[PDB]
Structure formats: structure tokens, C-alpha cells
């Protein structure tokens, strides 16, 4: 093999024979700390990534008259202000295949884990027209986010682009990871793009996926901080081009972006460098157009296209817990609803910190299964009543028994809501939990022991009444046999829990 | 090299130089300007190319003072991206951003110089071992543990802490860590740099007798330097630390003070440079520059660069771009608050806002995690009852919630600490208290077992036993 390795070289050496094509080639006027205002490229389509003499590929966005202002997808230190830069007929595409499953990549779709090099003959263009209204359909089936808070009072159906928006450090990344970690029994290919997050946090998330075993089906498109502005700009579109392939080939998916505020910050960078006029908050002209273009390509396709569904789940980090700022209100206008992770509810022990109020979901109960459609109705009603009676939380001084019982049941219901870190609640468990909480069956216990009682009850049920599994997984309606089985199981577990 | 420059324009700290067409330096390439001084002929002021304007001239920020530079002065490009001397020789000396000794000792050797603006470490090699760290502080060892070999942020208002805390943290750790520490005075005030140099040389860290032995290697690009200098002294500290993590195979502890200067100086140069202004007034490439500093600080299987950047929140605008971009990079952030300093509770660390991703239970210990959760919840309940207390009187709330209020007062006063370096401000000696001791203190405080002690008996106290002793002292002083 000592010379057979070089004999393999002869294959491609004799293969490539170089017909004479036209390469749009112009000189570089100006390298602008991330942008290279190259000159002379006339017949270059807006978006053709150019390649320099030093192999520093960059996209050509700002096509002015006498200088096409390209932005560099690499560290452009080696450009020499005169090195003839050539164009490429590529329109910023990426290769896509099934073998990306599990290997973290950058925006170039080049594997950054290093444990392989994914092969692909099919390529989906990174920017692409979103599903038309002839192809898009309404949201039927739910995406089990594993959380009682974001699967009972506010659902997320497959195809609906909910919004995990909240204060700094409230659990947005942890809730998105809880969703991706629950999505194990189902068949969704969960693409988790990380924009601007530090390298160590992406390492922690990928090693968490590999520890939980949910990394078999998860393309964590990773953009480190020192990665240039263009890649932190392009990462959502790269993950979207992967999940769009996986959706168009009939597989439901779940693309979870990270820090769309950081994505818009990278677009702010590259535009303000490219000298494009800034709007509000100095964000450029087309921020709303941008976020829509990568965020409205996420929905349920029709039957004649393949039944697939890309269910986006962005993460918009808003500071000081507000929606008045430019990016949060824009992405709220784009997204079908939102969930508010509030730092106050976070520090007050309610984990996940899902605000039970203003965090509306546009789909509503059309996404939830029949069991949730029956139980989470009473859950939402009782949480609304408990939030109305949140003012009488301590001042309930021997008041009317309706008020007292309702307030105590609400106080217990919020400790139903709160749940441990990265703990996925498969629907078969959370239906019984929300039932036990909303039908007073745990009014006897104090505020503290609801968590222990419910964990022990879920264990005992899932180990000793496996017919509930068949009913909830297959029939998916809270019928009479399941109801009676759950009541009897609750009674037996409450007895042995009193026996401690 | 030899490529003479002929500086064309000098608009403030940003000077652009019209090179010949064929021989043009690359970006981030040092440009020593052979220019005259105020008195005398020889003077070498350094400049790094920031962008190539394309009229055969390149824009370069100035590392020394821009006064004294002539339109038409000869200047050569080094061809090397502003090399900085590192190795065994950088131990013990205060360094400029240029890479020179500022302590007027014997000059360093150029045997092991290193480029200052290099590529980030690839994700293929990233050491991620989650191990808690015992700094010495009650609150930020309990309420917000620090990640050993991981970035840590001392956010805060102007003068709430974040430099006395940096001084105490270096005073604690720089002796314990076998690997050296690389303190970076990025745009810090000079007199605090003087205090830190004196405190290091008195605490045996510098060891002035044997300067080649020190476990610290300072770089000062302090407050009174041209905006080029504060833009890159952080990168100088990073280059020394990256050498000590790439070659010497030892875990190093870099303290950068006021990393916000690394963004504000970037603002003052980006204004003149031709780059358009971003939000509230910073540079456009705030996030990419901040990442270009922060990403190079990673435990990379050869060592572990633990780092504590004393981020400056501009007037406690906790939503401003300069802290908003650094919150994403900083693992064990620690927001110090002027609100909890105006009432004298020092350190001014917020119990709620200061949070760390090392407060996961399987990483930090189950009982410690539970105590941290209970303390944070009690403080959150107090912050939510601050409106009822302030307006409707302390009495108008419940009598269990009153116990929670008094318990929150006890906790938020108990998490005060007498630092060794803050004895000149307190007047009382400092008490270094471990992690398990503060856990055992908080357990008895919030378990309701000792809700009888006066509130001042928990103020500025090392341990719960010292608090019990101060209760006796105060009860005797009350009647006496």
C-alpha cells in the first residue's frame, strides 16, 4: 500500500480534465474587517459565495454598482488587496443526507465533531422558498415537549413554531434540551442549531445528548463565538436546510434554534459592516424578513407532499424580561404563540419557569390528544382561577370553603407543574399526573410532598399497570377503563405512601 | 520587514498608512512607526492593521500615543501579528500591550515570542470536566459555584465590587493553584494596578527576590492608554495564558479586570475606523470581537484556563450590549448589585441574579444544591415582598411569611464576608470560610433553629459560630 496510496491519486488525476468555463473574477478593493468589498464581479447572482486565492469562501450579499461587497465566511486575514477573487456557481448550498445523524456541524455543514466525514450526494439550498399555502396544512398531532407546563396549559403541536422566550438564564436551553431528550420514542429528527453559544455549552449539550442516548437522531449545528459573523448568521438556515430535507422525506422533525437574538446580532454585524442602513435598535432593514425566511419554513406539509412536518422551536433571549425590544416583538409577530420563562418564577423554585399567563399558544387545544383535551382543560381553568386567587395566597383567613379548597388545589397544581432537570415526562405519565392533580386526589397532602408522591405514583403505575400504557399509547383517549385503572392505582399508591 | 509606509492621515488614535501597491501588510499585522518623539529623534510606536482601505492605504489603530506622528513618516510592517514575549521570562513582570516590561527591571528575552491574534481552538479538542471550585467566599461558593477550568463573570455596577472581589480571589487562589496566574489589567485604573502589584509582591506571589519564580504574570493596558492599547491588552493576557495552556501543560488562572474596556476601546476606534455605529454606541462587531477574546479561554485537554473577568455593566444597564454579549460566554456569572451595596451588605453580589451552570445537583452535591435552592427561593420571596413591606408596613403580611422575611434578612446578611483585602474598608479583620462551613451555617439559619439572634449578629461575619459569638457580644453590649 506504500505506493498504492499514491496509485489511488492517479484515478482523480486522470479523471479531472478541466473544460474551459467562465469564472467571474474580479479584484479586491477593500477588506473591511469581515467584509471584502471586491470589485469587478459583474455577472454574479446575489448570493453566489465567492472563493478567494487563499480559499476563504464568502457570500456576496451587498451588490453595489462598482464594488460587490462580499462577507467572509472565514478568518479573512490572508486577503492581499489585489488577489483576484473568483466566483462559484454555488448559491450557498449545503450537502444533506441521512448520515448527518449525531455529528455536530458548523454552518458550512462540515463536521466539527471530527469523528467522521459525512457523505452526501443530495444538496438542499440553504435559503429556499418556504412551503406554500397549497402545501401547508393545519396542525394535527402534538409534539410531546416532556413538560407538563408546555404540554397541558399551552401545547406545541407538530408544525407549530412556538417561542421559548424569556429572561437571561431562565432555562430556555434546558427546556429545549428537555424537549429533544423526551423526543426519543417518537420518530422526530431533532435538529438543535446553536448560534453564538460558547464552545463549552455546546460541548455540555452534546455530551448530555450522548449520555441520554438521544444523540442518535440530533444534528447539533454548532456555531462557536469566534466563528465569523456569516456563520452565526447562516446557522439557522443550515439547520433549516437539514430539517427541510428530513421533512420532505416524510419524517416529522423538530428544529430548535438557539438565541435568535444572537443570530440577528450577527446579521446586524455583517450588515452594518456592509454599510446597509439601520432601522430600530440599529438592527438592519430586513430583520423581520430574515427571521420569517428561516422561521416560516416550518410547518406540516400536506398528504400529497409526504405528511412531513418541521416543527421549529426558537429561543429568543430577551433582556430585562420584556417583549418591547425589536427582536422579541418581531419574532413574536412571526411565531404562533410563545412561552415566557420568567426569572422570578425561576428563582421562586418553579422549574421549568413557564409563565402560566401571557404565554399564549395560537393553536390551542387543537394540538393536544384527547386525554389532554379532557384533562388539561380543567388544568388550564384551575390554574387561571389560582392565578386570580394568587392575591389571596396568604390572606385566605378561614374564608369560604370554595375559595380555600380551590386555592389549596392551585398551590398543589403548581408543584405538579414544576419538575426536575432534564426529566422527560412521557405523555402516558403526565396525563395521569395532571389528572391526579386536577381532580383533588392529592388535596390531602401538604404543599411539600406532592413531588415525592407523584414520582412514586408514576413509578408504581408504570411498573404495575401496563394496560394504561397500551391505552394511552394506542387508543389515545382517556376512556373508562383507563380512568378506573388510574383511580385504583392512585388509591393503592396513596395507601402505601401513607405507610411510607 | 522592509516595506516603508509613509503614513497618510492621522485622525486621532486611528492612523492610516499608504503602502506601495505590491507590498501591502495583511490584517492584524504590527506596524512599528519609525517616528520622532516630543524630544529627540528615536521612538517606536506600534500599530496593528485593522482594515485595508484599498487606495493603497490601510487603517491601523495606534498602540502608543498618536501625538507626535507626522503625515509622511516612514513606517515598516513587521509581517508578524504583534508578537508578545511569553515563556519562563514573562513570569513576574508587568507587561504592556506591546509586549514590553513596564517594571523597569531587566528586559525580557525574545526566545519564545507568540502571535497575539491567533485562531480559536477547534471544538474537536475541548476538555469538559465539570468540577466545582472553592474560592473562599460564602455566597459565591454556595449560591453560585464556580467552574474550575471555566469562565467566571463578576458583573456589577460602577464600584459595587468586582475589583476587591478580584483582589480577594487572587489572594486566595493564586497561592493554591500550582499553575501560574496571568492577571490582565484591561483598562483598569492604574492605582488599583499599583495596589495589586504591591499586594502580589508582598504576598509572596511575585517574590521580588527571585523574579523568575513568580506564580503570576501581569499585563497592564491600564485606563490611561490609547484606545488601541485597551483593545489588545486582553489579547496579550490571552496569549500568555494560551501559551501556558498549550505548551507548559499547566492549568492557569487569568484575571481580566474590566473586560468592558475591551469593548469600549473597540467602540472608540470603530467610530473613527469607518465602521457604522451599532446600538447604544458600541462597535458593530461587538459580539464577534468579544467572542474572539472569550472563546480562546477554554480547557483544551492540555490544561485548564480558569478565568474570572470583572465585566463592567455600564451604569448597571444589565441589558446593554457589552454585558448582554458576555452573559452568553460566561459560565458562572455573578451579578453584583448596587442595590445590595447601598445598604452595606458587602460583597454586593446579588443572591438571585448571580447564577451558575455548576448549580446542577449531580455536579455540586445534593444537599448543597438543596440549600442553594432554598436560599434563592427565600431571597426571591423577600424581593417579592419588598413592595408590600415598603408600602403597607411590615405587619400587614402573614406570620409565616414574616418568618420567611426575617429568615431572608438573616440569610442576605449572613452572606456578607470580611475579605482579607477589604479590611481597609471594613476596619475589621477578614475571615476566610470554606464551602461546607457556609452550607452548615445556612442549614441552621433557614431551618428555623436559630431565628432568635439579632439581625446585626449575622452582619459581616465569617462563620455561623462567629455569628453566635457576636450575638453574645451584642447582647452584653446592649445592657452594658
Amino acid at each position: 500500500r506504500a505506493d498504492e496510496i499514491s496509485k489511488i491519486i492517479r484515478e482523480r488525476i486522470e479523471g479531472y480534465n478541466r473544460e474551459v468555463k467562465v469564472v467571474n473574477t474580479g479584484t479586491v478593493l477593500q477588506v473591511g474587517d469581515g467584509i471584502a468589498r471586491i470589485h469587478g464581479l459583474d455577472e454574479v447572482m446575489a448570493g453566489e459565495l465567492v472563493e478567494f486565492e487563499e480559499g476563504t469562501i464568502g457570500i456576496a450579499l451587498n451588490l453595489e454598482s462598482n464594488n460587490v461587497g462580499v462577507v467572509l465566511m472565514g478568518d479573512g486575514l490572508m486577503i492581499q488587496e489585489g488577489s483576484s477573487v473568483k466566483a462559484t456557481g454555488r448559491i450557498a448550498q449545503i450537502p444533506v443526507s441521512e448520515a448527518y445523524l449525531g455529528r455536530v456541524i458548523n454552518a458550512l455543514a462540515k463536521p466539527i465533531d471530527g469523528r467522521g466525514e459525512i457523505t452526501a450526494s443530495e444538496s438542499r439550498l440553504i435559503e429556499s422558498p418556504a412551503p406554500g399555502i397549497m402545501s401547508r396544512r393545519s396542525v394535527y398531532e402534538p409534539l410531546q415537549t416532556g413538560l407538563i407546563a408546555i404540554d397541558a396549559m399551552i401545547p406545541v403541536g407538530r408544525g407549530q413554531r412556538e417561542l421559548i422566550i424569556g429572561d437571561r438564564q431562565t432555562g430556555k436551553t434546558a427546556v429545549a434540551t428537555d424537549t429533544i431528550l423526551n423526543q426519543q420514542g417518537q420518530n422526530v429528527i431533532c435538529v438543535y442549531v446553536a448560534i453564538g453559544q460558547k464552545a463549552s455549552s455546546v460541548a455540555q449539550v452534546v455530551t448530555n445528548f450522548q449520555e441520554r442516548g438521544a444523540m442518535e437522531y440530533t444534528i447539533v449545528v454548532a456555531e462557536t463565538a469566534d466563528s465569523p459573523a456569516t456563520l452565526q448568521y447562516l446557522a439557522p438556515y443550515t439547520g433549516a436546510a437539514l430539517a427541510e430535507y428530513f421533512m420532505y422525506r416524510e419524517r416529522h422533525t423538530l428544529i430548535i434554534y438557539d438565541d435568535l437574538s444572537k443570530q440577528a446580532q450577527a446579521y446586524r454585524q455583517m450588515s452594518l459592516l456592509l454599510r446597509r442602513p439601520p432601522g430600530r435598535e440599529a438592527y438592519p432593514g430586513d430583520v423581520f424578513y430574515l427571521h420569517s425566511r428561516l422561521l416560516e419554513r416550518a410547518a406540516k406539509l400536506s398528504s400529497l407532499l409526504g405528511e412531513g412536518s418541521m416543527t421549529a422551536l426558537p429561543i429568543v433571549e430577551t433582556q430585562a424580561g420584556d417583549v418591547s425590544a425589536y427582536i422579541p416583538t418581531n419574532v413574536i409577530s412571526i411565531t404562533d404563540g410563545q412561552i415566557f420563562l420568567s426569572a422570578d418564577l425561576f428563582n421562586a423554585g418553579i422549574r421549568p419557569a413557564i409563565n402560566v399567563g401571557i404565554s399564549v399558544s395560537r393553536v390551542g387545544s387543537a394540538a393536544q390528544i384527547k386525554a389532554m383535551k379532557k384533562v388539561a382543560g380543567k388544568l388550564k381553568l384551575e390554574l387561571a382561577q389560582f392565578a386570580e386567587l394568587e392575591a389571596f395566597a396568604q390572606f385566605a383567613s378561614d374564608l369560604d370553603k370554595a375559595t380555600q379548597n380551590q386555592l389549596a388545589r392551585g398551590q398543589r397544581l403548581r408543584e405538579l407543574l414544576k419538575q426536575p432537570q432534564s426529566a422527560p415526562l412521557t405523555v402516558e405519565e403526565q396525563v395521569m399526573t395532571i389528572y391526579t392533580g386536577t381532580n383533588g386526589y392529592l388535596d390531602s397532602l401538604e404543599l411539600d410532598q406532592v413531588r415525592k408522591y407523584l414520582v412514586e405514583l408514576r413509578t408504581y403505575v408504570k411498573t404495575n399497570k401496563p394496560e394504561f400504557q397500551e391505552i394511552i399509547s394506542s387508543t389515545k383517549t382517556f376512556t373508562e377503563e383507563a380512568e378506573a385503572l388510574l383511580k385504583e392505582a392512585i388509591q393503592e399508591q396513596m395507601e402505601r405512601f401513607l405507610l411510607q | 520587514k522592509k516595506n516603508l509606509g509613509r503614513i497618510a492621515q492621522i485622525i486621532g488614535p486611528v492612523l492610516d498608512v499608504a503602502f506601495p501597491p505590491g507590498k501591502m501588510p495583511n490584517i492584524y499585522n504590527a506596524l512599528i512607526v519609525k517616528g520622532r518623539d516630543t524630544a529627540g529623534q528615536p521612538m517606536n510606536v506600534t500599530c496593528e492593521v485593522q482594515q485595508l482601505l484599498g487606495n493603497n492605504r490601510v487603517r491601523a489603530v495606534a498602540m502608543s500615543a498618536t501625538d507626535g506622528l507626522t503625515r509622511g513618516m516612514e513606517v515598516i510592517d513587521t509581517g508578524a501579528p504583534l508578537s508578545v514575549p511569553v515563556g519562563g521570562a514573562t513570569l513576574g513582570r508587568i507587561f504592556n500591550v506591546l509586549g514590553e516590561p513596564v517594571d523597569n527591571l531587566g528586559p525580557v528575552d525574545t526566545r519564545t515570542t507568540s502571535p497575539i491574534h491567533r485562531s480559536a481552538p477547534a471544538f474537536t479538542q475541548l476538555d469538559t470536566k465539570l468540577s466545582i471550585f472553592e474560592t473562599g467566599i460564602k455566597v459565591v461558593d454556595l449560591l453560585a459555584p464556580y467552574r474550575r477550568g471555566g469562565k467566571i463573570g463578576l458583573f456589577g455596577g460602577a464600584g459595587v465590587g468586582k475589583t476587591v472581589l478580584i483582589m480577594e480571589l487572587i489572594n486566595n487562589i493564586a497561592k493554591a493553584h500550582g499553575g501560574v496566574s496571568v492577571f490582565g489589567g484591561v483598562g483598569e485604573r492604574t492605582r488599583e494596578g499599583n495596589d495589586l502589584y504591591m499586594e502580589m509582591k508582598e504576598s509572596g506571589v511575585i517574590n521580588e527576590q527571585n523574579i523568575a519564580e513568580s506564580k503570576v504574570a501581569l499585563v497592564y493596558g491600564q485606563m490611561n492608554e490609547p484606545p488601541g492599547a485597551r483593545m489588545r491588552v486582553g489579547l496579550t493576557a490571552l496569549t500568555m495564558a494560551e501559551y501556558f495552556r498549550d505548551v507548559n501543560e499547566q492549568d492557569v488562572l487569568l484575571f481580566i479586570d474590566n473586560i468592558f474596556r475591551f469593548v469600549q476601546a473597540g467602540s472608540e476606534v470603530s467610530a473613527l475606523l469607518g465602521r457604522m455605529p451599532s446600538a447604544v454606541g458600541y462597535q458593530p462587531t461587538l459580539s464577534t470581537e468579544m467572542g474572539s477574546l472569550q472563546e480562546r479561554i477554554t480547557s483544551t485537554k492540555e490544561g485548564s484556563i480558569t478565568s474570572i473577568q470583572a465585566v463592567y455593566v455600564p451604569a448597571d444597564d444589565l441589558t446593554d450590549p457589552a454585558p448582554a454579549t458576555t452573559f452568553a460566554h460566561l459560565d458562572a456569572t455573578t451579578v453584583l448589585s448596587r442595590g445590595l451595596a447601598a445598604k452595606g451588605i458587602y460583597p454586593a453580589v446579588d443572591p438571585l441574579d448571580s447564577t451558575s451552570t455548576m448549580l446542577q445537583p449531580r455536579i455540586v452535591g445534593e444537599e448543597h444544591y438543596e440549600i442553594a435552592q432554598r436560599v434563592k427561593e427565600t431571597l426571591q420571596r423577600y424581593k417579592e415582598l419588598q413592595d408590600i413591606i415598603a408600602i403597607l408596613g411590615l405587619d400587614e403580611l402573614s406570620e409565616e411569611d414574616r418568618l420567611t422575611v426575617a429568615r431572608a434578612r438573616k440569610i442576605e446578611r449572613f452572606l456578607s464576608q470580611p475579605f482579607f483585602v477589604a479590611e481597609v474598608f471594613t476596619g475589621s479583620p477578614g475571615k476566610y470560610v470554606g464551602l461546607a462551613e457556609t452550607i452548615r451555617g445556612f442549614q441552621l439559619i433557614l431551618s428555623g433553629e436559630l431565628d432568635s439572634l439579632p439581625e446585626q449578629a449575622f452582619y459581616l461575619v465569617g462563620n455561623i459560630d462567629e455569628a453566635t459569638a457576636k450575638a453574645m457580644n451584642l447582647e452584653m453590649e446592649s445592657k452594658l
Binding site: A320, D322 | A315, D317, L318, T319, D320
Partner: peptide, 12 residues
């Protein structure tokens, strides 16, 4: 934001 955030806190 030290002006807007204070007023948001006061309105809350």
C-alpha cells in the same frame, strides 16, 4: 436599562 428597567420594576 437603568431608566426603563427601574420604571418597569416600579410598575410591577
Amino acid at each position: 436599562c437603568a431608566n426603563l428597567r427601574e420604571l418597569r420594576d416600579r410598575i410591577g
